[PDB]
Structure 1
């Protein structure tokens, strides 16, 4: 087995017999994924100190009580994926300390007598996928402290007040009744339970009339979390949920219930709900009175809550949701917005509208007029086929912090008036766009940015003086990768004292680093953390470009052609934590180049390089590798030399340096 500290785990050993050779100073034993004839009752004499046993995923036919007598200190008893054709009460008469019983696949058809007259400390009772037909588990009052009762993937036809009366004072935190073909509910079947809080009815095929009758039956109860998923709730009426008007609910779920129509006042009898979900529904439309009465909701999800003839939302449809703060409408097909769609939401702070608009190619200053009176903090608009934005689009939303406009085809000459009205925004998501032309005043109106990534935007004309990034001072993260920049001067990025993260992947900086004077990039970047110039076609590193980068942490210069390693290139990089030079054309590793970066390096990566197995090239590198604990992944595999012929295709570590000094 693994034989780790204290606990013992045996993932896969093809074990067939209970072993007794392992040390006895253990408290947990694992038997998952093993083939056993039958659990012996007398072989546990040696192991009488196990707190719990993970004896599951086993082909055990019959269970004997004597086992859990030899181990009185037994807490978790998992018997899932086992045969267990039939069980009786005599297995649990002198077996009381159980706290966790798991029966997930045992094909237990009928329950006889009272098997649980002695278990007084059990909390979770998982009895599912066993073909159980009647929810009766006993006649007398038992299960004083039972918090979870799982009954799923069985064939219960109905619930009756007499088969559930055996729970006298049980306080069930979570009740599971999923995948049960329930067709009717006897009156008073829920009042016999002491205190029930949550219920699950997934894959239970609830009819709307059956759902209404269930809601009537659920009155007087302390239910707070109710879930109704995978049903035939194609429509909802005013009186459908009226039976829940006497309950104090917290969460209501209606996902995967193909709801087509929402009646007027459907949830008007729910003055205490705080979280609501309508995921994956073919809702035709939402009337303004559909949400009437929901004055206490705080989280609404409308993911895939619309039909393909296209669905639309009327104005003033969210006025009643004055306490909502998290609205999600991802993956929908609303054509466009109106003047009074979001009007009424006075507490919305997190709004997601990803892939929800189809006819909103052009954005004006009337699209987000409804959100002026709402202090939003996050706005998601990805995959919305955004093509053009007008001035004053975000003027109303002056409290925005997180803005998303990526994964679109925006094409426009940015002038800085597109962000007019934004007071204090944290970061802007404009990656993955077809064409965004920058100007000298594009970022002047918003100097409060903290993160700014422009991946795959085909940006151009960024060498214009003054740089558009000049007004940004406290910016921390900047990304201009995958854009194929033609050229850049030292004017850009100047004054970014607070900049920490910089990425220049796929930007062809080859010629920018001797003719016309080398560009002295990275001037005074004290706060820069990680520098990434991977796959920029770099061919030669000019001297004096990594200076003053004392606080730099990581360097990634892979997928390039670097062979001319100038001496003393890395002098101030004494705080480097990870050096990446994989897939380059490095031939020799000299001490004067990689010395200071190797003083306190944590991980190194320069694989796929034509190394030269010679005393002049890798002797210092081989000595350092042999005399360091730096994490070098695939050191023995992808570090083969390319020259000479004798040492071609040989591991870098398998080189003797005792003959050269």
Structure 2
């Protein structure tokens, strides 16, 4: 995990664009310039937007990085981040990640905020978030998720923001949010949910905003009556895409009628 001779930047970082990023961070003249492990240790934040990066190989050597922001690159693999235990903010939006290697996050116990917005994740590993006990922000919106493993969020007690919008979720596991007592902001809009389990939001006593629109709610499917009663009791929580209170924004497919309208309250 260390370099024992001063080494050209281009050698430690094979990605030409990432090596350019490292050179700018260290403020050297050229990527051919020789860098020591002491100089690499001074880097604690990286910002590389839209830099056509394919690989962050060589980032294993930057043990003090706390702030890592690499949006709109071409990353397919984040294995090289497994041991950056000082990471506290990790924003990887608009990349092309299709999977998370199992245990890729088990060592990142200092993470506050994680964004995997606009990636290509079709599934999540079991227990993938179990070690991120200090996580407050989790954005998974605009992926290709087909389901959520049971208990996937059970360990994220400090979570205040959870965005699952724009995926292809057809169901939610029983009790999938039951441990998220501090959650203020839950986005489920634009999925394929026909219903949710009875009392799925019942234990979210801190919820301030929820987005339920653009889901094919089935007015006869089991559990829709509880959802309708929940919406009628928490009408101000429910928001539309413009950001306004809209308890009617969740709509029964086919008929188009508000899920709220199912029961009279």
Q: Tell whether the structures are fold-level matches, with TM greater than 0.5.
A: yes
1:405 aligns with 2:48: yes
Gapped regions of structure 2 (runs ≥ 5): 1-7, 9-15
Aligned position for 1:477 = 113
1:557 positional shift = 0.7
> Counterparts of 1:166-181 in structure 2 under 5 Å?
none
1:472-510 superposed Cα distances (whole Å, 9 cap, x missing partner): 112110011211113321231221111011111122221
1:437 aligns with 2:77: yes
Equivalent of residue 174 in structure 2, options 543, 548, 560: 543
> Counterparts of 1:415-426 in structure 2 under 5 Å?
417-423=58-64, 425-426=65-66
Aligned counterparts of 2:87 and 2:230: Cα–Cα separation in 1: 34
* Partners of 1:367 and 1:393 within 8 A in 2: no
* Partners of 2:214 and 2:250 within 8 A in 1: no
Seen in structure 2, the aligned counterparts of structure 1 residues 479 and 639 have a Cα distance that, compared at 3 Å, is: closer
Equivalent of residue 592 in structure 1, options 214, 218, 226: 226
1:367 aligns with 2:10: no
1:489 aligns with 2:120: no
Query: Normalising by the residue count of structure 2, what TM-score does the alignment of the two structures yield?
Result: 0.74
Seen in structure 2, the aligned counterparts of structure 1 residues 579 and 471 have a Cα distance that, compared at 3 Å, is: same
Seen in structure 2, the aligned counterparts of structure 1 residues 478 and 601 have a Cα distance that, compared at 3 Å, is: farther
* Partners of 2:92 and 2:116 within 8 A in 1: yes
Aligned position for 2:5 = none
Aligned counterparts of 2:212 and 2:22: Cα–Cα separation in 1: 50
Equivalent of residue 452 in structure 1, options 90, 103, 128: 90
* Partners of 1:534 and 1:560 within 8 A in 2: yes
Aligned counterparts of 2:21 and 2:39: Cα–Cα separation in 1: 8
Kindly name which structure, 1 or 2, has the bigger radius of gyration based on alpha carbons.
Answer: 1
Seen in structure 2, the aligned counterparts of structure 1 residues 426 and 442 have a Cα distance that, compared at 3 Å, is: closer
Equivalent of residue 605 in structure 1, options 222, 226, 239: 239
Aligned counterparts of 1:400 and 1:486: Cα–Cα separation in 2: 33
CA RMSD in angstroms, aligned pairs only: 3.9
Seen in structure 2, the aligned counterparts of structure 1 residues 443 and 641 have a Cα distance that, compared at 3 Å, is: closer
1:555 positional shift = 1.0
1:7-60 superposed Cα distances (whole Å, 9 cap, x missing partner): xxxxxxxxxxxxxxxxxxxxxxxxxxxxxxxxxxxxxxxxxxxxxxxxxxxxxx
1:544 positional shift = 2.0
Aligned counterparts of 1:364 and 1:393: Cα–Cα separation in 2: 16
Number of aligned residue pairs: 243
Query: Normalising by the residue count of structure 1, what TM-score does the alignment of the two structures yield?
Result: 0.32
1:521 positional shift = 1.0
1:551 positional shift = 0.5
1:523 positional shift = 2.0
* Partners of 1:576 and 1:600 within 8 A in 2: no
1:409 positional shift = 1.0
* Partners of 1:371 and 1:397 within 8 A in 2: no
1:387-406 superposed Cα distances (whole Å, 9 cap, x missing partner): x9xx9798615344432012
* Larger proportion of strand: 1
User: Residue 367 of structure 1 aligns to a residue in which SS?
Assistant: helix
| Runs of 4+ residues deviating >4 angstroms | 368-372, 391-395, 594-602, 638-644, 650-653
1:463 aligns with 2:104: no
Seen in structure 2, the aligned counterparts of structure 1 residues 605 and 392 have a Cα distance that, compared at 3 Å, is: farther
1:524 aligns with 2:155: yes
1:633 positional shift = 4.3
Gapped regions of structure 1 (runs ≥ 5): 1-338, 340-359, 373-387, 608-630
> Counterparts of 1:379-394 in structure 2 under 5 Å?
none
User: Residue 90 of structure 2 aligns to a residue in which SS?
Assistant: strand
> Counterparts of 1:84-483 in structure 2 under 5 Å?
361=17, 363=19, 367=23, 371=27, 396-412=39-55, 414=56, 417-423=58-64, 425-439=65-79, 442-444=81-83, 446-464=84-102, 467-483=103-119
1:365 positional shift = 10
* Partners of 2:217 and 2:259 within 8 A in 1: no
Seen in structure 2, the aligned counterparts of structure 1 residues 590 and 519 have a Cα distance that, compared at 3 Å, is: closer
Seen in structure 2, the aligned counterparts of structure 1 residues 409 and 578 have a Cα distance that, compared at 3 Å, is: same
* Larger proportion of helix: 2
